[PDB]
Symmetry: D2
Subunit: 391 residues, 4 copies
């Protein structure tokens, strides 16, 4: 079996030929799942006989077979990624929109910063633009923490304190409308890891985002967090209103919960790391790169459902109709995009349109679904003129 | 090729019923339009009970492609009898919910027994199953809303249609002075004004009728005049809407509102059965292609938009919860029918008269929750990791 | 006493001297209450103590009350001069757009402006074009509400309609108030439920006749036809009310809408309409005929709702600033009531953005700005305002 | 002149007889306007008899003759006070039999008041006084202070400025113009609070308002409950939410400390009055800014006009529209169970019972107000010339 891949790649094969063929499939040599194989190549170090090849490739053979036999959701990645660069370049030319000035940290970012990162459910990676520049999740974290809550607590409990539908502060039942709005996000924040101090709660959530991202970059911006606390009049009013209406679980410290809320909003990521988080959501709770199970299918289901209707702010309904993909946006200019069973994505540009969404990101998401059939209600069998990367 | 099949069915001669029996186990019905030539030749040959390589080849030759897929288990649900058995359990479970109230606002709806319950399944490959009362005619009512909206977009395209109507749910008119969506009476009335403009109601009606006939694979589609007359007597609500829409200039130029309402009431009065309606849903799940006729009815654009709205707006006020828990595009009506669509897989019609507080069929809502609970068909369920759920696609 | 009045005026009084003095009191010789006196005068230039008392004796109470300065506004000539100033100041506002939704309304000249005043004591003043007939439109809403309450009582009337502002149906599933189309449509269904539509219309007409002291009241079939031709909003409301069962059982909703349109199509003039207002200000008693048209209950409720609901969307602001119960209509008329003092009809065609007459509103502000007539103004300490009652 | 009066009330007048006649007018011997006359009677009584003669009466009533003349000449707004007084008692006794309602428990201070407490105080525009029930028991103004502090703002700042930050009409937190609907809602009151006495500390603001309330009450009891204030600022989640929202929407004037304003707000709610003291405040409103008993001008006619217009529509909470339609009087209520009632040009009142109904208004107060208008024509839109079964205390 290790020998087949060998012939598939002629008495002896050079390393760079095996590596290039590997990178071709969309995989990265730094992939955690390939670690054992890459450790061996380190020791071996130029030409590989049947024996040496089999020696290094053993542990990781199953994953390597899938890549080379093109079993991945997108068999031809190189062509698909070329399309991604087109859409990226196409969106790059939209200079409209406004960068958030409400805090110095948001205003400091250049409007020209633009990047897109793709991570499939099989771990295939592609990046273009500025994908390595750290930025705060802001509202993009709302789906993530909601997932954590539903994962730990469960659906029945979590929705006792919050609503499952769009709006149009509280609903008929005196619950916030959903987890994707500040009022609802705040309540969700109070549900996580009850009984411990903010430090531990924050360590717990942080560990969780690390799992979703396959231990890729996750960080915290204290500068943003501090300015978030000073300008938080809007959220304080909500916090007091929730407290008054008894929306919080018993024993809750409201003023403290708000600071945790601001902390979570100040969490830093990159297009690349975030795309892995979205891929976990598209992969049913399993981190595509690490293969580990981060979230229960129940949590991922609920989150994608609410990201669908509630994710884009006031542009949600429009977005659900035209784009048909679950997504979440934040004032940093990030858009966390998920294509179920296919991939996950993070688009980042600071300038936002009048509705609070990234101009480029929105332009990119539209073109994406126009090009391929990722639309939730697109038909796999008959898509018309659309392109299916899965074939 | 045809010979390959013949071998799959041991001895030199095949009993004619053996082939038919094995055929049926696929969920396919011998009356299937795509099977006519095979079945015609089969009874003609049977006129002059055994088959041979060259005989079975003579009968199956014309339809060979479909037969192969059926016997090779290439259909979306490869094991139909298993999936079928589950459907019955779900049906049998929902049958035990006797709650709900049959709609009395007109004599026609009130006449129906609370105990009438049935479900029909038509997959994207034309696989068929029914249990309960699937042969009883009933009006679509609001179930027609998505169907006539699909027809509008198909002919007029998206830009034009939604110029007069909204694409989202509602907490009469939205901020743009348009009905919130096609799934509400106001929106449905405007959609009705868009179809087949410039002609009389009789022509418009026939235009939609043939259209529904295609979606149903020429299965039963009918009209209840008794319901139509009652509908137009009791229509104060919809008449109020018509004048408001007229006042707010929500109709295409040269529109007769009173005439549109009449067309509207007729479209609600169009009647079907669980079985024929199941094919309708399947066509929506098939991307616009009628599963049993293999014929193109609606454009992928029209079908997509229709499913998008059935997701959010289809369930009345229970839409938000239905979308969250069930996660399937569906439409409900006062007759107690629920038009259900599982994309890429199948479509159904669940019909019971008794309605809940929301106006949705009690047994239908129950059945849908169980279906998605049992199976991974939920919109955001994962095709790779579904946990405890079942995947009938294997 | 008729002797008394005589010396108040030589051994001989010429009629013109008596006639001039009387007009000065704000009264008209055409006044229905002075009919007997005026009959005698024509039945007879100069006259003595005996001939005077002969003509005057029958009206002596009103005449003595007038000449003794007992009328609500003792000095009318001054007050009249102020009304003219306000009229002239408002005359300079040409902004506003005449209502075009029907031909009849669009025909009216933007420059048509008039003000009529009728006190509770029958004093009359008019300036501008006060003799020109125009449709009451929404100005009739309080009038037909007063009629309803009068006949049916407050308890019955308010099962079908709300008592307060809005900001179609309230929580109770009733129209918010009588001053909005939805409510006026329901109110219209309450009146004379037994008879046919022709008799109903006659009944209201006669009622409006008493209210106007038998002054001009008329009907425009032109407006009525145009009105019913475009009813879509009002038909929309009608069907919604019918569906919500907001009408009294046995009602023909569609027939009612006809009646509704007819009522909006009734014609008045600034002068005749000002009397209608004066009746509302006088507690249901027509100032000039001394007759009792409306119950004090109907008048109280009517003035209450005109206060909050009368001005369309400008009602709240009008109540806060002007502080007078009033009703406005699409024809550009404003039915103004100053309780215990007088009543008025301000008419100019051009509407403002809120649907109220531009000049009319301008006039109402200056009036309350100049005088203490504001609802919550204090009679004792009003500061720099004028009190015409003194 | 003083002689005329002397006769109209033998060759000599017993002092108690003059005192008994004066009290009949509804006036009080404690009337600040009567002090000179009253000091004289006491002094004179020392230097002599118990009996008074022409020359002597001339000595005592000389200074106050004007007011005394109008009292004995039946020229007060209500000529027969004792008949009217007799009626007020009947209404009080009728309303007293309504045992429904729940006393506000949201803080300890309100719950401590017994449900049985019921009282009504009347002060006419001429200073005529009547009280029945418990009118001497102190209680916090609460929302009853809303129109008062708003009047102070309009008096100092005028209408145009004050209403930039607040709406002039009912609701149905912010209106279409992004302002609080009116001064009578917590959101509006909090904004009105920010307008008063800017540039100075809370202790100064509080004193400035306090002395203003003293004028309106004719220097009768005005007090502060710290027990209630502390409880108020612990329970203020609702108002803190509003404050932050107001702060976010830029509703406050420049350089405004919101948390400091909320504290000032709670203090104003905690100010204590009695039915008798408060009734005088209401009468000052009915008198057009003049305190009936002191004859002093507290507020501008403009300030009072606006306040009454808003009390009319916005004063009763959600019962405002119904109240305005039936009762037809400007009024304000508070969680303490007090109702500040004003009859323009006639009198002013304070009705107090702790138990509140579903709408937050005291059952007894509301019941009383209804009977009050049923009996007499005080309705804003009642006619002075024509009323049906109603009686007119202003008529002889
Ligand atoms: N930290 C901000 C982010 C707002 C947003 O991204 O929409 C908040 O929670 O209000
Ligand atoms: N024809 C009925 C259908 C109602 C419904 O199914 O919701 C109507 O327009 O009211
Ligand atoms: N006849 C018009 C009158 C509108 C108005 O006067 O404001 C209607 O009923 O709508
Ligand atoms: N002082 C409390 C209650 C006022 C009241 O409603 O009486 C507040 O401002 O919320």
């Amino acid at each position: 079996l290790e020998d087949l891949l060998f012939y598939t790649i002629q008495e002896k094969i050079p390393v760079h030929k095996f590596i290039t063929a590997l990178k071709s499939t969309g995989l990265r040599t730094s992939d955690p799942r390939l670690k054992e194989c890459m450790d061996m190549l380190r020791l071996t170090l130029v030409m590989l006989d049947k024996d040496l090849f089999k020696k290094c490739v053993q542990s990781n053979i199953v994953l390597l077979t899938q890549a080379f036999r093109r079993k991945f959701v997108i068999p031809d990645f190189m062509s698909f990624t070329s399309h991604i660069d087109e859409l990226y370049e196409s969106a790059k030319k939209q200079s409209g929109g406004k960068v958030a000035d409400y805090i110095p940290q948001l205003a400091k970012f250049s409007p020209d910063l633009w990047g897109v990162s793709v991570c499939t459910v099989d771990g295939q990676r592609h990046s273009i633009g500025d994908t390595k520049v750290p930025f705060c999740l802001q509202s993009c974290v709302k789906p993530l923490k909601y997932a954590i809550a539903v994962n730990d607590l469960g659906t029945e409990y979590v929705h006792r304190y919050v609503g499952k539908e769009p709006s149009g502060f509280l609903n008929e039942d005196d619950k916030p409308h959903n987890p994707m709005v500040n009022a609802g996000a705040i309540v969700v924040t109070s549900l996580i890891k009850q009984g411990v101090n903010n430090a531990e709660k924050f360590d717990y959530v942080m560990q969780f985002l690390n799992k979703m991202a396959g231990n890729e970059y996750v960080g915290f911006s204290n500068a943003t967090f501090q300015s978030e606390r000073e300008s938080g009049d809007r959220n304080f009013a909500i916090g007091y209103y929730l407290k008054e209406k008894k929306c919080f679980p018993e024993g809750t410290d409201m003023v403290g919960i708000l600071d945790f809320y601001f902390q979570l909003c100040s969490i830093e990521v990159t297009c690349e790391s975030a795309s892995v988080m979205a891929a976990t959501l598209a992969n049913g709770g399993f981190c595509p790169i690490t293969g580990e199970r981060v979230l229960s299918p129940e949590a991922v289901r609920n989150t994608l459902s609410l990201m669908h209707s509630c994710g884009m702010y006031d542009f949600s309904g429009q977005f659900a109709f035209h784009v048909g993909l679950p997504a979440k946006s934040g004032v940093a200019g990030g858009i966390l995009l998920v294509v179920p069973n296919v991939m996950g994505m993070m688009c980042w540009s600071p300038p936002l349109d009048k509705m609070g969404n990234s101009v480029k990101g929105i332009h990119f998401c539209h073109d994406l679904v126009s090009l391929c059939n990722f639309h939730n209600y697109d038909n796999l069998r008959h898509f018309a003129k659309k392109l299916d990367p899965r074939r």
